[PDB]
A paper describes a structure:
The RocC/RocR system regulates competence, a specialized physiological state involving the coordinated expression of multiple genes which allows the bacteria to uptake environmental DNA and integrate it into its chromosome (i.e., natural transformation). RocC binds and stabilizes RocR, which in turn binds and represses a series of mRNA targets that encode components of the DNA uptake system.
We carried out further truncations to define a minimal RNA-binding region of RocC that would be amenable to structural studies.
Author numbering: 19 to 125
Write the structure that this text describes.
């Protein structure tokens, strides 16, 4: 389909291929700590459509600095893997770190 004037082709690829993690059309959920390495195992298929390992890292940084991502990192919320499986909880220190980032972004 049409592609927009400013976009992340890497994040579009991630949302198409791992919607449980990167499709936020309805909701957004905390991601497994270290999900970047899980993503990098799929780098070959991304490279076939011109998506580089660096751009995949860039896309994950973009996603996880969204205010809506930072706001979903509340203590005891469930972290999911690339396929939506629960793996861990957001800790109190992780929650605190996210609330400080939000407060600084919104000040």
């Amino acid at each position: 389909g049409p592609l927009g004037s400013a976009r992340s082709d890497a994040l579009l690829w991630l949302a198409a291929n791992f919607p449980e993690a990167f499709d936020n059309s309805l909701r957004i959920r905390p991601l497994k700590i270290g999900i970047m390495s899980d993503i990098l195992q799929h780098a070959e298929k991304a490279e076939q459509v011109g998506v580089s390992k660096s751009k995949l890292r860039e896309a994950v940084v973009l996603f996880t600095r969204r205010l809506d991502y930072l706001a979903c990192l509340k203590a005891r919320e469930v972290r999911i893997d690339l396929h939506g499986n629960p793996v861990a909880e957001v800790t109190e220190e992780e929650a605190e770190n996210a609330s400080m980032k939000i407060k600084k972004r919104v000040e």
